[PDB]
Task: inverse folding
RNA sequence: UGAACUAUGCCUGGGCAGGGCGAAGCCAGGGGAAACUCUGGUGGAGGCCCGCCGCGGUCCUGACGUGCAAAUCGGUCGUCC
RNA sequence: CGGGCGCAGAUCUUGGUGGUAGUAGCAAAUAUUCAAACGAGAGCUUUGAAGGCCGAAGUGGAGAAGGGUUCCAUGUGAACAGCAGUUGAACAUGGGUGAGCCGGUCCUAAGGGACGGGCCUACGCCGUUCGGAGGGGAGGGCCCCGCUCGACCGAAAGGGAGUCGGGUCCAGAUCCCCGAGCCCGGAGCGGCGGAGACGGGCGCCGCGAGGCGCCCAGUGCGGUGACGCAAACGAACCCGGAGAUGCCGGCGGGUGCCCCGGGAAAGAGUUCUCUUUUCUUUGUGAAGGGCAGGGCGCCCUGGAACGGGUUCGCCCCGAGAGAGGGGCCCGCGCCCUGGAAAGCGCCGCGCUUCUGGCGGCGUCCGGUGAGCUCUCGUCGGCCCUUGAAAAUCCGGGGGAGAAGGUGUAAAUCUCGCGCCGGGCCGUACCCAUAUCCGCAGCAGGUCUCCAAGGUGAACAGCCUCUGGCGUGUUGGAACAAGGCAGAGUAAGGGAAGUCGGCAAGUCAGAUCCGUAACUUCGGGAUAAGGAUUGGCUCUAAGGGCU
RNA sequence: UAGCAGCCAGCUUAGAACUGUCGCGGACCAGGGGAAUCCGACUGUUUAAUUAAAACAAAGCAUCGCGAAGGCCCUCGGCGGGUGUUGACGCGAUGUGAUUUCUGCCCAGUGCUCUGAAUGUCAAAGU
RNA sequence: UAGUGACGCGCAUGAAUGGAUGAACGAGAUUCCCACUGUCCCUACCUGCUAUCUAGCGAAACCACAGCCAAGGGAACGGGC
RNA sequence: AGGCGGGCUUCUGGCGUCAAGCGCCCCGCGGGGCGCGACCCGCCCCGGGGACAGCGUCAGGUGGGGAGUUUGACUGG
RNA sequence: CGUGAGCUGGGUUUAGACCGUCGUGAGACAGGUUAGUUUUACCCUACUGAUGUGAGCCGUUGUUGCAAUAGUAAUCCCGCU
RNA sequence: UUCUGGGUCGGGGUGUCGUGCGUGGCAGAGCAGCGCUGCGAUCCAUUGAAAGUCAGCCCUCGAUCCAAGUUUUG
RNA sequence: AACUCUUAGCGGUGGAUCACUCGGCUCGUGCGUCGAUGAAGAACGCAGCUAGCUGCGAGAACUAAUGUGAAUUGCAGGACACACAUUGAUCAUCGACCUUUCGAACGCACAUUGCGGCCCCGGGUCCAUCCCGGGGCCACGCCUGUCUGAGGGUCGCC
């Protein structure tokens, strides 16, 4: 058993000084600094607690190098609103605009 | 420390070059009047701040 | 002229073995005419308990007392979600 | 004639030197020992062997602050290192820190602090998102763009795109060398390829494959759906997401480590007797492609009571369970490219400053665990505690605009690849019983990461492997008194000692029994009071898979 | 069909025999106990370098000020600044000190406070 | 002469300058009992590090001069007379 | 300083962004501009106080919050 | 009022704190109560022991002794007759 | 410092603890393989055996060594 | 014998005394001049061998010029110095020239050699974008003038 050390000046267990063990081709176990886990987008409705689907979960500035299809879905409000709240916005917009015809 | 500023590193460079011993030919030039540098500092005894 | 010590507050980070008693909630089996009760298990609450690192510094009024030290050392001891 | 004109004292001032005095002292953390080499000189340096300690909350390996050359090689032994020295953190002579992807730089947190204004006789001070005619970027060819804008400083542990594997030095190293990548910025031709590009409807040449004219299309496509396809125009403006959320507990997936099974391979150890034995080594980076595995209040069909599903706990269902079939996300696990050529292990040959090079073989097959950490998820618990901002990045809404008229054009979130660039500063070493602070090599103080085997509930104590060290500013010979400590031990008595059970002595783990007065009903409680405990040989019960 | 066969896998619990000098948490680790009185409820905090306590804090209780041109307080000063990103379930100022059970009499003194130009004392300015 | 339970014309107790009580809690003060023990009767023995001796190294406080006593006188307790 | 003075939104956790329309005018079927839409006039942006708060300066009261100082002597201590 | 570089700090007799009485208050108590650093000898004598010293040397060296002088130690009770 | 004398080992005596290693057993709770064999704390015999015993115990005369020369004194 | 004390000689320790003085102190006299044309102060750097001090500023232990007329010096050594006659060693004076960074310090800031903007020039790019290098600039307050504006504030003419 070997006791490995850090590889950078930062010697504290901060939120950015996170590592993991990797086995090198030289039959060693060294630290390998990992990036912070990303989060998939949330719905703009502010109701559904679950995250959005069909979208990568990466860091904010990682989204600059990704393609557009990897950041939205082919629906109307894809990438910013869940499918369940889109079909409710369609029914709410249609039914409210219909009651405003009955009044005339 | 290992993290220095350029001004601090430039200040430590001068104090490192001032801590050199007096040249041998200076002693014969002055006739043993100036035998040793009276400003020699030790890293354990004298701190430069 | 000073908050590099210390007192209090703020911002941003880090850290706190192993065990013990074991509360609400829940399951099951018995007692009832209803009010409602009893046993086992589950659950894992707490400025809770024993206790390591940590953080403190009781007693010996020990050691030391031109000392290792212009306040330290040893056993013991307080606390440790 | 003019004075700084006469010393034994003032715990007088400064400098020097005695008695005490070869005296006190060089006594915290278990340890040294034999031979040899170098040397004028060895208890102390170096090498080898023996015997030991630190025992993974280390006397180990690396950092932050701080130090500033203390780092490394050679030389010297005057001074210093409170004995010595052939030694050093001493002295002398040379040498040493290499970056687009490590950090600073960039962002604002607390907070500091300009601007307007006010104030102060004044140097100046108050005040900080408010307050002035505070707008000097964007677009249409001269129009109109801006309330959230109030400068700026402020983190080497916060936010923050992108570097990893192997080798190399006397000292350097994610920076050098080799190999493999990645990110950001740059383009009227931005250099190519692909996408945008799918063609139809009327007549003729025509018994044909095709060719002639007009007209009309074409800012992609598939799936019931979740959503998927290499791309897939789009301004002002708006909305939203990520950056960006506490502590605690339970469980599950994956790595690392440990352990077990190969009567596995390669070396080594042991053999007086036994031991198919004991010990060591058995490998894969980032990035990309694929697949296990984990998660999902995601979709479609359908419809539930004899309610069912389900967790360690919970929780879930007509606002639609169970079941069947799908979608998406995380994949740091496995296979492949990298990639074995390299790295380790073993063997052979050549060679002794080109020599300090060339070859051979191997790098294997499985298992699980209340195991320990790290990590990703998931379900909860607690709060009269709700547990950060900003830079930056992205999606949608929006349809102002641009593009060409029959094969292309506008536009392309590289969309397959190619081209160029990435400046400045820090980078050595110590990081503590001798490189920091305490006048010192001071038993003090000083922020973190990694962390093995056995006993055991344990990161307790005791022992061992990796690693480190010579017992902590000295050796030798004695074992008087008197001390400090070993919490040394003791006849008979058992607090008569003493201000006082001060001191230390009894008790102590765990299992099975048994536990009062009192009480705020929580407790008291490990109350009190008993029994059992080693070793060995068996028996019984508690699982998984086909 | 009161389920069986094959294979694999650990780690615990209970009982029994035998046995050593009745020794067995064998080192290590590791609460002496009981009956009462005083004080503080408890946890926490405190005189760095002689006092760790009965002192301070504490939750609970009670009183007091104030509706913002305000209460409390700061500044040499700006009608500047703190509570205040606040608004009486709030902020500021005090005493007591959990829970239980109670908290008696005295407003003459001192102090606070209210009433008022309806009468004494009573500055500057004005008459 | 302590401790506890009572007695109360209490020098000088007394009710949020809070009275009384109090389970649990305490390195707070105090008394008794069981067990235990060198606290004691009454000391003895062993061990480690020192003291001791030695090689090397090597201070300081202090110091009018100094250092045998009895009595006397004396500034009423001399070391000196 | 977003509608002050004088003569058109209550059923839902949608949507609302520089004007559609009409009238008129100017250039090369293609562009541009103006007015109505979006009423007219005006003296302060809109509200709440208002010669009272407040400011400057004298005067009286209060003022251990703070400053300065004092707090005799003799004496069988 | 022998005896703290002999000890023990219980008391008294600093600073913390509680009560009673007193003072408007800060504070007082010769009243009660609790916790509160006990430093240094290596110098000179004294004393306890341990080497050695008349040095003038035909004296050096050894054995067996004498003795001045100083210290001086025994005490009390019971049983039988 | 040689009628010899003095050491170091050994032997014996003494005493302390307490029945050594090995070997043998049809002793052994048992248990597992093919009467036999293996595992198995302990027990029994050899075995009052083993170990250590003057360094401050006692006696030998067995073994093998040793004998030199500091300073000063009439 | 030693040891202790006293006296003297010599030798140590120590530094007094005396003599010396490129220093101070005091008085008097003549001048009486800093800085955005970047001061005082500070930082860093500069010599063949150079640590300090002094002197200088990348032209860095000094350049040009003038006067002086043969040296500098520790050892070197080498002089576009010397037989000056290839108008000059050194020193003095100092009318030319030069003078890094911080600093009133001035693009914004500074525990940062951090972060910017404008104009011009050369190169890479040659399709004027971008990259590198060089130079000139960009603080606050205020005065005069120019330019560009704002308000029915007061008016004139329509
Ligand atoms: Mg950790
Ligand atoms: Mg130091
Ligand atoms: Mg925290
Ligand atoms: Mg308890
Ligand atoms: Mg502790
Ligand atoms: Mg501790
Ligand atoms: Mg403290
Ligand atoms: Mg202590
Ligand atoms: Mg003590
Ligand atoms: Mg002492
Ligand atoms: Mg005089
Ligand atoms: Mg004198
Ligand atoms: Mg020691
Ligand atoms: Mg340790
Ligand atoms: Mg050097
Ligand atoms: Mg070294
Ligand atoms: Mg060397
Ligand atoms: Mg030495
Ligand atoms: Mg060396
Ligand atoms: Mg040196
Ligand atoms: Mg900043
Ligand atoms: Mg960071
Ligand atoms: Mg290194
Ligand atoms: Mg690119
Ligand atoms: Mg086509
Ligand atoms: Mg095409
Ligand atoms: Mg094309
Ligand atoms: Mg954060
Ligand atoms: Mg956070
Ligand atoms: Mg969790
Ligand atoms: Mg379902
Ligand atoms: Mg869009
Ligand atoms: Mg380093
Ligand atoms: Mg040391
Ligand atoms: Mg002793
Ligand atoms: Mg003792
Ligand atoms: Mg005894
Ligand atoms: Mg007594
Ligand atoms: Mg007694
Ligand atoms: Mg005790
Ligand atoms: Mg009890
Ligand atoms: Mg009572
Ligand atoms: Mg009492
Ligand atoms: Mg308390
Ligand atoms: Mg204290
Ligand atoms: Mg009160
Ligand atoms: Mg109290
Ligand atoms: Mg009352
Ligand atoms: Mg009254
Ligand atoms: Mg008693
Ligand atoms: Mg009583
Ligand atoms: Mg009374
Ligand atoms: Mg009273
Ligand atoms: Mg009272
Ligand atoms: Mg407790
Ligand atoms: Mg206590
Ligand atoms: Mg107690
Ligand atoms: Mg406590
Ligand atoms: Mg005297
Ligand atoms: Mg006063
Ligand atoms: Mg006074
Ligand atoms: Mg008087
Ligand atoms: Mg008189
Ligand atoms: Mg008397
Ligand atoms: Mg006395
Ligand atoms: Mg004393
Ligand atoms: Mg006394
Ligand atoms: Mg005395
Ligand atoms: Mg006392
Ligand atoms: Mg008393
Ligand atoms: Mg006191
Ligand atoms: Mg008293
Ligand atoms: Mg044995
Ligand atoms: Mg002896
Ligand atoms: Mg004499
Ligand atoms: Mg003399
Ligand atoms: Mg002399
Ligand atoms: Mg300048
Ligand atoms: Zn939703």
Result:
């Amino acid at each position: 058993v070997q006791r490995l050390t850090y590889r950078r000046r930062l010697s504290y267990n901060t939120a950015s000084n996170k590592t993991r063990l990797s086995r090198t081709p030289g039959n060693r176990i060294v630290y390998l600094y990992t990036k912070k886990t990303g989060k998939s987008p949330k719905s703009a409705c502010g109701i559904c607690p679950g995250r959005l689907r069909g979208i990568r979960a990466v860091r904010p500035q990682v989204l600059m190098r990704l393609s557009k299809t990897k950041k939205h879905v082919s629906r109307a409000y894809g990438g910013s609103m869940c499918a369940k709240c889109v079909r409710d916005r369609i029914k709410r917009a249609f039914l409210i605009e219909e009651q405003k015809i009955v009044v005339k | 420390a290992s993290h220095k500023t350029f001004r601090i590193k430039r200040f430590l460079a001068k104090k490192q070059k001032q801590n050199r011993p007096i040249p041998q030919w200076i002693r014969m030039k002055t006739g043993n009047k100036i035998r040793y540098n009276s400003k020699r500092r030790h890293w354990r005894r004298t701190k430069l701040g």
